[PDB]
Design a protein around this nucleic acid. Sequence first.
RNA 1: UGUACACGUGGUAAACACGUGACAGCAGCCCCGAUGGACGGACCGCGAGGACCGUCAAGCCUAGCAGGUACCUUCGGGUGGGGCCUUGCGAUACCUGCGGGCGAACCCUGUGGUCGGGUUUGCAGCCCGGCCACAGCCUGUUGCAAAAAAGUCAAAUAAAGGUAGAUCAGCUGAUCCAAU
Length: 817
Amino acid sequence: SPDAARVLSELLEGAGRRRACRAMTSRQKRRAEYARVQELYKKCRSRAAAEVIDGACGGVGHSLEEMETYWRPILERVSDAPGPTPEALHALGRTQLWKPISVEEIKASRFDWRTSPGPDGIRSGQWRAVPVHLKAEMFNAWMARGEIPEILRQCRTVFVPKVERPGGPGEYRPISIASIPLRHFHSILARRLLACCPPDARQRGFICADGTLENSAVLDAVLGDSRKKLRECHVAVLDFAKAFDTVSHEALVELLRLRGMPEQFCGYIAHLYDTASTTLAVNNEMSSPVKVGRGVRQGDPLSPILFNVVMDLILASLPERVGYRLEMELVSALAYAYDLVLLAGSKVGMQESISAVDCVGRQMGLRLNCRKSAVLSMIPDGHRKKHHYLTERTFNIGGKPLRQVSCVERWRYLGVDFEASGCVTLEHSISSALNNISRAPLKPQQRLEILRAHLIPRFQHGFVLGNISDDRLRMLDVQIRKAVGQWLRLPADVPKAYYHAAVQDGGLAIPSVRATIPDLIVRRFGGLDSSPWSVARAAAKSDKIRKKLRWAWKQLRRFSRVDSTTQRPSVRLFWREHLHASVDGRELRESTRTPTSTKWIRERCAQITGRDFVQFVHTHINALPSRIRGSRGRRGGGESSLTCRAGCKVRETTAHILQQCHRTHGGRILRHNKIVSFVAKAMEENKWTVELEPRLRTSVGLRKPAIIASRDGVGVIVDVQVVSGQRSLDELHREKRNKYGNHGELVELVAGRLGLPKAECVRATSCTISWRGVWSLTSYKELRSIIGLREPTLQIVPILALRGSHMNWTRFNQMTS
RNA sequence: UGUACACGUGGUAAACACGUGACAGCAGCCCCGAUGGACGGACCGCGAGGACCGUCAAGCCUAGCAGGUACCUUCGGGUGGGGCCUUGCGAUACCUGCGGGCGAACCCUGUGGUCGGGUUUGCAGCCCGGCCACAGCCUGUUGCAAAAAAGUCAAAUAAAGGUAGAUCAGCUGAUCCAAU
């Protein structure tokens, strides 16, 4: 339709105008990085966390000089791959594509709209505003012509450092960004590829299920069986580094041609890869267009799908009667994301498998990193009943001798935090990630959230792929907690449960790998025999798997409490019990029943400044230095180390500073006035005729309720009061309510003042909250029931209480005579 | 191994016997991640802990990790310190490398040899990093010196006689709780 052509021309004109507008020191680059990371974090949190952990904070340090000269020859080099050979064709031998795009699959495609703009300039809306029918028409026209507009094919490449302190242009990685319309068009084609012919059962990477689930179990079962019955077992892991950087376009197209795919799709892929370009954007400087001759583009939707055909060919090239006989099951190869794990019993069989892999990789231009691959070989011998590890190098990939490793510490088949090949463990990659988070231009709450939700769930898998102990997990926990205490400036003697206890109970909710690794093992290997894999079911009924499952159950039972409502173990209850029973975490024990008293720790974090959040955390856990809290174990002196500095001649605890001290009386008045004004304004928003500090010269004495209000014939008294948490908050709420709801004459006075005759119309109420921002459940319910008060206006009263509490403490500290 | 216990056998029964065994149990709970070391002296409530003073040489700790060597095992395997107890079958000796923090060196370049790399069909060349060596009584010139002076009083020595803002510093660079 001409409407689609018109809107496409309009969008192209907008992109061209944006390009024309764009074209026409340490401090400044740090500020630019801060602005970029803040915009990215506020836009897409997961990608921002991935970028900050990956190390994309220091940017580059070499400019376009010595970076375009270093990388342009690398990106411009056509592979001299001979292409597929008839033997590989027969090894692989051991239709509905390119159909017109409908409107159902466009909306059905789960395309993440929370991305970054491409080089043309379509950021997030100009592609969202297009209706599905117009996008379908444009996609159909593109397939009919076989070409994408040349503005869309352009992509921008930016270099992210590998080493935190690069010393050359060679230690950067060229991550590419392409246009959103192209990505959306190619996502449909990738989904069609999956729906057409799925990969083999051995290939459990880019599949429609969790990939590294049963692979670790199968590897560990193989290792345990070989170690048990004294069999011969060779396990070679070879990683596909530059899987994305040396594949030849012509050989890839030829392989896709003989797989049986339609001629049109192969021609489209050939046109896409032959007509390719790239702009090297370093420090927001332009570069001349760069040709690319080595295929599989970084970040393209089709790339991890195109490489599945190559990996399927590689797997089909393997010899038949090779592998390990794990319980009458022949396990040949385990394909991770970008790794091949080959198992064999005979040295000749392992050499044969490696040789086949190498020959296929050589005939299609792939390079295999012998610096990131290893072989672990267990050779038994008779008359000794022991297992011996090979130390000298025996296998080789086309001449280069593969290194022989004795242990299994290459559990890096988890994804990012890529492999070191027996040089360093999985740690010192977590430490590097912690440093990346620590040095980035972020806020302390942002660091907490990134570590909570993106760092831990991404390395925790690797600690399962082997035999592990409790001490390693405890040491990892210690290191992570030290990093968190560095970020938040917390002292050493803070409750260990405070870091890990859930947000609802009051706590930073940093997961503890010591407790979530046994839970992961229990949840993952329990359903091992229910999986529809055949090798995994065989690995389920083994000896090492069962022993590890028993160890995991024991660790979970010792690091959990049984949930009454479901009769299941729960680490959250364990941490809650440990924290609420602590000294500093005791006063938070009431925060479980009021989930709105802890909405600032995670939910309403972006609304709080960094120093405000840090001081809120300091006051919440009572990390404030006082003569009582700061003198733990050093109370052998006189009363001068305990007496209040204001001359109160009493024990100077934080409660004394913050709740009863003549020095901080004005601060208490100010905090009370702030809370009263906030609630009064909130109630006036609800059409409540609010009076402030009413004058009731009652006969009994001098009563000063906080606020009084009325609405269409029903009145209310609200009293604001901030108290301690050592006693029950509900008893304080009731004791503050009774002195007004049972005085007898105050009710009549308020009824007369408000303008309502019946004294039962006006009901007394209170707004009770502790100085740690812990609500009283009765007070919260009464505020939500008597007066119409929504959740957003109730979640700020903890903020006001915490801010006023720290205000009082720093007023006490700032003047000392 | 050894305890406590279900079935079956034959037997009139038993404080009789044997065999097969729930993944059969029973192999208790809680707390602790610290810091250079050998040898002579003054400190402390000489008490559980913490300073200080001398030399010395490079190593010193480690309930972190990996692998190998022996012993007890029981087949599973097993080696830190302290407390509460209570019944509630367990397991130790060193050496090597890696990781951490304490040292110490380390700074005159370039040849060599290794280990990480990356470039590359290519371990050939190549450029980055970490180690090991090596072809070197006071008148003055030169090495320990925070900038023109403090004084090493016998040295080697002669017919000597600025930022968006703030801060620490030494206009620049880091550090923020500050930073779109």
